[model samples]
Target chain A: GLTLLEKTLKERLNLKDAIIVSGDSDQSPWVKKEMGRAAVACMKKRFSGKNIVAVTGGTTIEAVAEMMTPDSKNRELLFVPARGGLGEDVKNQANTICAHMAEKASGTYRLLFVPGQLSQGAYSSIIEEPSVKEVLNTIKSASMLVHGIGEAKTMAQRRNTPLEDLKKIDDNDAVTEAFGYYFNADGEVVHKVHSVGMQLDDIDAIPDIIAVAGGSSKAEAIEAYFKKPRNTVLVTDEGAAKKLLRDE
Target chain B: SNAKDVLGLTLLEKTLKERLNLKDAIIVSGDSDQSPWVKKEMGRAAVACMKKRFSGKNIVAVTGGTTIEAVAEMMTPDSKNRELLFVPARGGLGEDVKNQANTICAHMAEKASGTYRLLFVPGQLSQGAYSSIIEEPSVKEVLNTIKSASMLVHGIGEAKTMAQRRNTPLEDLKKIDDNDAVTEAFGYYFNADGEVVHKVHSVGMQLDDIDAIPDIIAVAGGSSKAEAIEAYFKKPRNTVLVTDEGAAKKLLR
Candidate 1:
């Protein structure tokens, strides 16, 4: 069922696979929802008898949550936020989205309750707390991951970045962000959010990762993120897809 | 009642019970709308009423808002050491995290040293989302828990205020306004006649479900909410109302 464009994008990014929904999400809001549906389909394909699913927060993932439904196979699923405290609004925060997804999927969830910003001292102490530590263990043991990508500057502004960090991100020419790590056009980590939960290195242990994002505006971001060997499925829309391949 | 009339509260309580046709009306002194402390007194009174109605094993479903938060704050472990379980009366209503029913229920459980189970549905839902969510096993389990609730404690809001507070969709807001909705509770909007004019699409607890609940309490205070309180009690809901002097005096007048 893969479209020609989908095959090409997957090969181009060296992704495990790519799913391209019709229309540009930037121009048509419904296209984002379409991508969400597509992502959900892809997720179902990877479901196992028992799964620990980790997810991040963003409008795209929120859409995915909206489109999610109970697993027909009745997989034992437990959803956990991939990370904590990236300064997203409550509705778009991972805790909120994870709960939404689990509820829709007929799954279960446990939440991490750390504030957005933390001091080094606070981080060390907070991560050791039994409740926080439990979810962190769940995060590292996750079988699948669902996350969203964003234009670096847009994500910086959305998270209300501190001026000092904003300067560093700008100076490094960061173009893409995911899971709290900002990447340059070369796909090198330019900056990272200091918080608890999933680290970029942890992605290697998880066999299934779906990165969902779209909009022609995010073409550069999507491209930059895939520059490295992410080994993830890319669920995106035509707006970003066409723009990304236009140069090819 | 006559002997206690000198305190004014007993007389106000009696009058409100008669006017609202409530099974019981508990009124604390002072205008919560003006004096902030009056809200706490209403909270204390509501808790007392709750403890009185609590059975050996109790399941309490609660709603969100400042008033209900006060109820949670005033909650204490039952002196009788009865088993307690708390659950949110309904799902999210677009309120901020602090004012969300899930948050309030958890707090209430913590304060009472009881257990709590939360419904995880989002604030707003599409028809498709709503249809799919209720069937979720985890959500279904929680809904079952909500249905078994022995007591339901909720907050009432002026309909327009609640609609705006929840960041209601424009179309829903227009519908609410067009209907001249006067009050809101458990995500249902009512007109002056206490008719259900509109309701937010959500999971867990429906208005009709309240009829099966043995102990139902509507907690609202402040002069600002007098109209809401009166509008809600227009129909016989067999609910106990815990209010303060501001609303009691204004409703009486």
Candidate 2:
């Protein structure tokens, strides 16, 4: 009785803990695995009762899914895709990643089918759909946010961006992409794409933020994302950490 | 305002599970009818149930619909040392490509880090083609694997919704309505008595052949679906149910 009483409730998610990986994912492969190991470690450390947990999609983040372990300590978790679906491969969306996390951790999940590159009219109409609206609500309610910062051009290319959108991203000199929004070192929106998932407003409300990125090549991108007073804990590899602290 | 156990399941799930005597029951919070988030939660529950029994090159069967699609969204590579083989529950006809069992089967396999063997047979195969395709050696091999699947993940929908989803003939719809068929699963429709009111012609498990299936998880939710799930379970035996609280409460009430 005491055990059940003591263990029945727990805080669902975690705080802004940053972890960096060494070497650029843009250049090397194994860096993600190391970063993934560090990430799963840091993720396991932050656990509590029931909370809506959101995650962004990327290979680095995928590593986190690939190496996840159950924190039965915080079994009352719900995993949600951070944003609407992206044009990227089915494997990398917060949709797939959240699904993986829920299964491995013995938790529950919800996926939003908000596709990227919607026309203004289409985006407005789709957002009103009851199904989509429900998940959008969850994304807004998310207490903990898990994501990986990515180089702007690489991320854009991987998304198979429209020519005009790519040109705009290029013109804005977008340095880093996080939480479905891109930014330059100066912290401009750099032309946000129309996706049905996360909105800019949700970030301010999310209490816990975990941003993971690494490798020396990602230093600039990571630095740019951290500019906005957001990164709670940035977990990174030795390679990226060394570069981040080593100014030009 | 009903009795709920430590797990949050109301008399609804426990009662339904007991009445049906299913292997297990899972009732998540909220109503899929009221909110879509709950449907995904039900899906997650279904996947977790399967994972509990999964081991050593398991073969699982799946049907399709938005509910099961959400289940596929939750499939992941977990403790299993070998990959799972996901086979379509049926070679359904007349549904859109994305919602068909074949497509959902592959998606579930990919998300689960498993592999699949597609039937390659088109959605609306001609009667002649259906016969020939069934005779195909590859088809036979896959069907055999499906016949031996230890678990089956399926979808349950109101008769009318499934009628629209499958684009059933008006005559059959009228027959179903006239028969008061409330539940549809694995191509067969059922009434409150769990009698077959109608059936859609598809290649898969027959209702009568269900005894061999150890885990027959029916993933469906929403207040609208409560009656349908209740109607199906009235046959007086257990088949694990994965549903939502709103629907569950409505059902019990």
Candidate 3:
């Protein structure tokens, strides 16, 4: 029988053009292999000489980036960030991933200079400045985006959500995180971690949204996210996939 | 003895001399259908006569109509006595009256440095609706200003035509015809004998309201409007009637 994660990914794959598979290597090896083969096929049929552009991030994205072969670079391609940089982790920073993809595809890379989670006032001020405005404008026009989902509470903690509001979210059943906002089963905002990154509306506007996340611990979060309106493409590993669908 | 003719004189000259010399001999014409040229000449003469009489301190109230349109065109803008105001004598039938009132007020305001307030309430509204609306602060302000009108300029409507347009019942129309009612005011139709033929609703200005006004001018045109002019005149004595050549000549018969 198909694992729960695999089954969900297969269903989502049918609906999307790209998939972001996020997980450590031990858990997502099959996903990476399958994605690599599919990338090659996509390159041959549609991406030849300039078509498919891949954006990967995190340790998982790094693994996928490492798995990518030079043969997949037959087209005029580019790689860029879905949003601003998220610090120094090579896999997590969009700039780093973009550089890696560019090196792999032998193509150009574009970097977004701003940090995510900026104050509204700071965001406005920066956007008004010419140098920042030019780059932000490019980010706004990006046709596709890929990112990883996080546990609402965990991500809130990571993003330094205010302590006072954390109590309220704990009172609620918020399990998933996307775009700095925590969503519960009913899609109510259990909590929010203000971040300077892709806005929810912007993610919905893009033609493709690929979220790569896995692990049994995150299965519920992923499931909750899937119920939302964004046309998401999910990629995950067998271990999480099997555990998610298995009847305890 | 016959009174001295004030026809050819300016409005100011006639007003002063007539009030001083011809007091109590004021002749108010009840005729409608006076010609455009005659009305224009009359208005010009009246303006001049009034200026001479009042030494330029006069507030002219104008009504809206095709004829008044002509009269307003004849007026020259002056800064010294730009206190002229155009007031709608009564609320009007929704569409036509609104257009007529707005146009007249806009023209007068442009000519004189004055402003106007519009009555949002319909002319032939029910007593309940009228009272309720009048009680509103915004409506009360407009009403108070209207009640203080020194000179009221108005348009008279043909009984049958107005009745139909106002959607009066066939039974009421028949009663008015049977009673020979030739006029209507504030929702009640009256016969030639001044008897009530029918009553629908009450709105602004009834007979008492007209009598209370310091000065009132009624304008009607077209031969068909002769009866309306006559009926309106019969309701009050101090009212002045303005008409066109065709209407005056035709209605006299």
Candidate 4:
């Protein structure tokens, strides 16, 4: 069921599985679509009755949503964003991806309507809304999660981190980020962004977690994020796969 | 219908229905924006849907747009002799007379050989003016007719596009823009979540009144309106959507 490279990476990263597509996303942007296809295929196999799939936002996960097709088995599916909001463009936001995925899959979806940037009082107040509470319940009950891993500095800048937090991230030599949590090369949490909904610690409770990221450029970030036993399935491309092996 | 089934649009219909949680979704061939004739096909499709849903006495409420104007163009007299009455869904929200709901409602009625009633309120009115005019016996009668609509046929538009076309006031435009409104329909602007962010204050049909209507048909098409369609359907709208292949394919993609 797996190639040597796929198996090797699976074991090295202690992941549940590893699916590798051909070509480097760094060299050819279209390869990202191929990785998306692979991730979609993985999802199809894992889908059972009444699946609640939670997804985070990024260009890679957006591809995954784009490649999604309706479940052939006619299983009930509900998609929700893994977290409230983040500092990405609306197109790459988790709510947008969740809706697109649900639409493509012929599934239903619930959106968590909270601002990307929230103050403590605002966060507490908004989460109390019945509409927000309903979706948060769905997010907590998610059976599957699809997300993207990012390079630390790139994500920090993309999110428009404040000067103090940027310095803190740089000083700690953070290498990778996932679910709004930045990690060092050793896979220790360097910093975590205060956000609503699913936290980094909440991931362990999810049954099926798939981390989708690729490009030779992201190899290091991928490697860093997977250094610990995450129990996730990594759906990546050959560029990152081969590069990951080369470094090993 | 036969060709659409063969072309697998039946599958598309089901997918979009489930996606938007609508009663039904109908997709015709071709893009209305690039192909001028496609809008008429959407109208034809909408007419078919309306005829199927028509009962003994049908009072249909309608909104104004180029798309609904096409519906009027494609309208033909009902063969079953069902009593049909057409009324504008709301007061004209700054639409030109040519594209006003009153104009489209009258044209739809004329083509269907049905009765019609017109709302003669100004496009924009102050709260004071609104309170006074709605109390007028004639205006009150028309408003009551609109509220009793057995069916509704309306158009959906991209928020930004509709804002510019309607020549919305700068303050209202700012509210729509700042709230990230993605779609507009029935004089109300909605964000991607289908939450009404802003609405033009007008007499006649309000958004909440839609729930009471027994049958509802929304006519919209073109790939450019895909996001708008998606955003409009975010919450359960319970309307049948008549669209084109361009929006269907682009939306699923």
Candidate 5:
């Protein structure tokens, strides 16, 4: 099952000219180690000061960051979350993962002060605020954006949305949630939980938007997200891929 | 009597007529900075000419830059040819070049009722990285499509100026100077003498690669870029140089 993730990461690294490492322990030991090696290789390849951009959070990203070994490559790489941090464990937050990735990769981190969810009025206001704008700008122009996707319902539950709203999403067949948007199989916006950081257009605007997810449990959700031509590169386990193609 | 008067045309009239007949080209100008506008107009004119000449059978290659973005905005989508293919002149940076390449393709696709294949190579990367990445089957397909380009649109930059913006250190600049290199592509720096100064890992078109392209347009402007543009021209002959009025005037030197 891990072979799928391994193959996917290796394929992305080779084909996308990227350094793809996953934090998901669902990845086999070999896959985890391979990711570490790739990170090291990427660090070494930096000619200018800053080179690597790290986005981590959730259990998977934390695991990967924990497994990373130190290297003397481009020491000036910048690490930040793919988006703003949702209120979770300080250890699992994007800011924490960014700090950890910077430490492990010999890079640096810029923290996003805002939280994940905010009222639209508040979100707009924050964009105008200097401190918030500075971080938002970085998130917008990120060269390399790493992220994790969740089953739509599960993420809504994690965020503690009202049961009625969750029911609304379920009724709409929403299966995947990333950034702030809930999407169904056709890339339709089933729902949007207003978030503070990056916009959907911003994600589409980026060159590389790498989504890491795994396990057979995430198959439908991942597939739902991959349906569109957003230049998205998926990193997932063999269990997921096999199950995804099984019905096909 | 009318024929006699027509035969006896004045020198001023002759000059005016000669200018009008030169190329049937459009002269695009702005008050202070006519270079960018001129280059842009020339690129637009060139594309229009190619579309007319080829009618419907043309494969267009494009390089990434703001001007190309302008071309994309100004271009009227054409679907006369069912086989219109868009190729990037070099592999691009994952985000910047990919977005640019895709945007160009999207615009072209909309215009021509065609689909495009994206090249996964970066315009700048180490040779090893480039070779390794290009080995993938998906990347190979894009490269193969790029190889078949009938027309290419690309941008040129002032070497030292770009280096400064890209943050090439003074020490590295010295190294380039020492090696007598004058230009840089992808991640490699070359001296005015066209020698390699320093090379970094990247992916994209090389000097050898550009040689095989059929119709290549190199759009650049500013007096500062004259030397770099001149050097690039030396390596590729199928290239048509597009410059601003100021650069064109200065380039006569």
Candidate 6:
């Protein structure tokens, strides 16, 4: 059931790669271990030489970190936060994830320090701070990035959706959220929160980017995000995979 | 391609499958012992098992030997519909470079329009050097991918034949001969009952590591190898065997 689904989705989505494990995460949370296992395996295959890895924070990525093994053979590995994050809990923050993944892979970690909500003025100065600038440089130069995705509303609520902007996003029909931006079905950025971290354009140009999310309930979220700035591939589970093919 | 050829091959595949408790089996016409093309046919047949994609990507781990070298020979350029990342099952053993796993892996990659990776070492690694070598990120890079292989294509050989090929130490050779080891695969010598009789210090594709791979296809032929093939199957395995009619006939007898 899984392999054929993976083959079809890989072609249907026009993705560089796909990994679809058996079982649905919405019903069997234990399947996160399965997804985590797949993601770690995918990373082992993707790198061949010294490399920089940029990571975003979320439960999905935390699962990946927990399952990571010393896989970057012959390659120097460095982990940096992909962004400042949305004032989400410390546990789900990208900076913390960067550390955890680095510790597990026996790699080095660089971090970002920033205000939860950056003023345009603050964003400019923060980027100029020497220590902050160093980490930012590594983020941009990353050979690859591993990230998480979520349903637009799920993320908005987690960030304590501000009243006025939440309505605009809800009204704009934001379907997916990634890297702090909301995108609709056609890959349109319907709305976003301002942050002094990776820009939308920088991620688009990096040679490799992987988006990990699963659960039958999140199928639409995955679909909506994939429609926007193309991700190179997805590491997911059978639940969302079957849902995607069936829904279409 | 013909009915007669296809019919016998089909029956042979079924018999091998049932007898060996294999996941699958494939066969070609004639004994590789008698027909030059039969070895190549078995090669093509073994590779044919990976006809579909899995987990959004495809990784194939293959070992080296004169048998699979024929497989590399018959493997057509760009025949596999999707890109297959080829990995040598292990680093160099003592075999000649041209017939070694790394050498054959590169050949298959070139012929298949796929990517290939090798764990290069200058000479036979001492145990300490071998341990540290695997710790190197570059070497670990290839090894991890190899371990994740969804499919593995390998060859089976007479125990003495492989012992001679690797120039095995007299002690190891004595162990193998004393046990009446009938078969060899990936440097693991097996007795007529398919038990491990001796192990060589070769890098890559250790026997224990093979249990996890989903597709384990073995290629061997020639009437003379009948006993070796039969010995490898004595212990039920989920392996698939691709062989020639001559070898099949000898085993059936």
- The window of 10 residues in a row where model 1 chain B has the poorest summed lDDT is B123-132
lDDT of 3 by residue, B210-251 (tens): 566655554455667656655554433565544443454454
* lDDT at A107, model 2: 75
lDDT of each: 0.89, 0.74, 0.52, 0.87, 0.56, 0.78
Q: Model 3 residue A47 lDDT?
A: 46
TM-score of chain A of 1: 0.96
Show model 1 residue runs off by greater than 4 Å.
Answer: A116-123, B1-253
Residue-wise C-alpha lDDT for candidate 2, range A1-248, written one tens digit per residue = 22221121111012243344445554677778777777777766665577788998888788888878777576478889888656678777777788877777777787674433344444454456554577788888888888888889988899877899999898888998886688998666777866666676767787777777777787778777766666366766656655555522
Tens digits of per-residue lDDT for model 4, B1-253: 6887898988899998888888999999889889999999999999999999999999999999999999998999999999999999997787644577986897799899998988865644445544554556666778899989999999999999999988688999999999999999999999998999999988899999999998999999999999999999898778999999899888888
How many times do residue backbones clash in model 4? 0
- Residue lDDT tens for model 4, A1-248: 23989988898889999999988999999999999999999998888788999999989999999999998899999899999666776667887788789879988887775643334444455566545677789899999999999999998898878899999999999999997899999999999887788988888999899999999989899999999889999999888988888943
Q: Compare candidates 2 and 5 on DockQ and give the better one.
A: 5
Instruction: Rank candidates by TM-score, best first.
Output: 1, 4, 2, 6, 5, 3
Candidate 5 local lDDT, A110-222, one digit each (tens): 66644323444434444455444656667766766667777887777776676777888999999897765889977678887654566677766666556556666776876
Give DockQ for candidates 1 onward, in order.
0.02, 0.02, 0.01, 0.01, 0.03, 0.01
**Higher-ranked by TM-score: 2 or 6:** 2
lDDT of 6 by residue, A112-192 (tens): 755433334434444565556667787889888898889988898887778998999999998888888899888788887
For model 4, what is the C-alpha lDDT against the true structure?
Answer: 0.87
Q: For residues B41-88, what per-residue lDDT tens digits would candidate 5 score against the true structure?
A: 655755565566453566677766555655554566564644676766
| Clash number by candidate, in order | 0, 32, 34, 0, 26, 5
lDDT of 1 by residue, A1-248 (tens): 33889888998888999988888899998999999999999999998899999999999999999999999888899999999858887778898899889979988887776642334444444456555677899898999999999999999999878999999999999999999999999899999998789999999999999999999999999999999999999999889988898832
